[PDB]
């Protein structure tokens, strides 16, 4: 079966747990991991991981970044740099930050700043799309 | 390549910026309980 | 007579178009297999797309067979 | 302290060093800073080791060393053949993150 | 008549091209699924592509039938 | 006779419709291989969709065969 | 006119060729969807290549309809 | 007899169906290569699908060859 | 009359052959779309082999047009 | 004649059947290309699996090729 | 004479299958694009397999055209 390990640097949510399916975002493309998924390495994108226990229960944790590894022996390791449960967020702050970022992206101070603002944009965009 | 790398950013920077965003977008209560254990005090010395 | 000859030729050669509808159904359902073997969580939205693609694809074969019927009956 | 103890022999080999460690508890931000200042420094290291003091128990610690690699090693490591969706973009972004992870783990230990 | 017979012959081979359309639509309505599996954060924006991928996909289909029209009554 | 030749040629030029159906079967069972190979646990579920696509796509080619036999023997 | 009938059957055979262009455009505009799913940031390049290939493949369908007209008229 | 000729006409215009077969088999044994390269571990169960699909599509294509032999010899 | 009728019909048969080149051209310009989405930093390098595939798929269509002209005029 | 000449078109319309075999073999070898690109370590086995799909598809085409050459010679 | 007419028709029908070779070549080169984008380092070996498969599908298509040439001339 699947041995899950979801752990922010600050806190650990699952330690070698046994869940049925886990849906995770990713740079390439958001996808799901099941009890025999082929081994892969990926680095997460601002999104929301969704876990389902052996039963039909669910849980959604919004993750900023990180890396998800699926190993030969069916062991998923989802190390997220900042993993927060949805009940910790507020809409207006994220929405205003997103709109501010869109406003400032017009100001092409430099390509590095353009990229930084773009990252902030789609970060807050995933936040709102999760909360809207 | 990705839209955030043409400039030349490392994925560390990508995660750092995304994490700062997700921190900024928390409850007013959890801001006090997350602003700590989030900053950085290390500083570099010229070689 | 030769009029019936052309009738039968047309009926026979019109139905061949249904091959495209068959291939469309095949490719759409293969895409469903792949896109549900990637992100199974959805499904409750993918199968909708697969069924819509079925309707749309089998429409072409239906058209070809109705053309065959009309050319062999009027 | 590490810089000083090794500034007599191996004085020249220093590439960069950091201060204000341990004054306050370390955080993933500190590890990210170290990783950034390592990658940006134009040194294309082909291998590495990290030495730290694993905390066995309140009485004992062990000077452990963990290896670390580079994307050129990962690509050519045949053992990676069984990992899919592995180009030279996700693989080395993952390597950057792995470097930051190991730095943070060593800092905490 | 031989003329009507040839009209029918051309009609039979004027509706075969619809198979092309049959494949076309399918491919798009295959790819969509794949795409929508790998990136549910572009669903809506994908629809536009899909409808475009439908119109120009069925386009030739209809035009093939156009020839049939002509080859039946022109 | 011209009419009997008509029926036989109609059957012959209709039977080709199976090509698209065969291509669709091949596409479906290639998609199944890839999908299962990525995510083996989903097997018995992917298999249902893929075999369903098989049968529910070869329905078109069998419609072509049925119309061919209709023309030949009727 | 037997020869006008031969022109008609030739045009009926020729008009099919646009099925190739239909299939090609289906492929192009499904690849567009999935590639846009993978790498949205480059939408403008995706349209450029997609439309270039679209006309560059419509080459064949326009050729086939043109030759249908030419056999019919010229 | 004009039937003795239209028989061969139909046989030739019917054996073309094997094209779609060949294409389906080709797709299946390409998809097998991708699937096995991606996930070499579960080698065997890939065959339990590859051979199944190949033989299945090959048989449904051979239906057209069977029909062609039937008409040419009956 | 029948000789030029054969001219017309055989030319119309030849004109169909460009459909496969249409399918292949669409395939190559969908593959370029994908391969550019996945590794954008190899534009021109990918484009070189893409235009090579253009040339080697246009070969078939232009040869089919050549044979069509030859058999309609020689 | 007609029945001694219609065999020519019979054979031609049978020979058209090889197009799909050509397409199938093309996609087989493209799949070989992609498979090798993914896992270049598996160079040996992939070629064998190719040869297999190669042979099966080309034989399926040979069926129609022989049907045509039957039309011309064995009717 | 009708023999020459049937001979033209046979050649024109046989010279359409190179559509298959065109589609196969297009698919092979699309796969080449994708594989190269996957692994830019390995292009020679990818190109080696690509030229082998290319040339062999070329052999099949040109074999079809050789049969067309023969039937026109014999």
Residue numbers in the entry:
A (entry chain H): 15 to 146
B (entry chain I): 1 to 47
C (entry chain Q), E (entry chain P), F (entry chain R), G (entry chain O), H (entry chain K), I (entry chain N), ...: 1 to 74
D (entry chain G): 111 to 219
J (entry chain L): 1 to 75
Lines from the paper:
Adenosine triphosphate (ATP), the fuel of life, is produced in inner membranes of the mitochondria of eukaryotic cells by an embedded molecular machine with a rotary action, called ATP synthase. Mitochondrial ATP synthases occupy the inner membranes of the organelle and form dimers via specific interactions in their membrane domains. Each monomeric unit in the dimeric bovine enzyme described here is an assembly of 28 polypeptide chains of 17 different kinds, organized into a spherical catalytic globular domain that extends from the inner mitochondrial membrane (IMM) into the mitochondrial matrix, attached to an intrinsic membrane domain by a central stalk and a peripheral stalk (PS). This membrane-bound enzyme is a machine that transmits by a rotary action the potential energy of the transmembrane proton motive force, generated by respiration, into the catalytic sites in the extrinsic domain.
The dimeric enzyme, inhibited by residues 1 to 60 of regulatory protein IF1, was purified in the presence glycodiosgenin, Brij-35, and phospholipids, and its structure was determined by cryo-EM of single particles. These structural changes lead sequentially at each catalytic site to the binding of the substrates ADP and phosphate, followed by the formation and then the release of ATP. Therefore, the rotational angle in the F1-domain is not influenced significantly by interactions with the additional components of the intact enzyme that are absent from the isolated F1-domain. The PS is an essential component of the enzyme’s stator linking the α3β3-sphere of the F1-catalytic domain to the membrane-associated wedge and the adjacent a-subunit into the stator subcomplex against which the rotor turns. During catalysis, it prevents the dissociation of the α3β3-domain from the central stalk by clamping it in position from above, and it resists the rotational torque of the central stalk, preventing the α3β3-domain and the rest of the stator domain from following the direction of rotation. A cap provided by the N-terminal domain of the OSCP is linked to the N-terminal extensions of the three α-subunits and adjusts its connections in concert with the rocking of the α3β3-domain during a catalytic cycle.
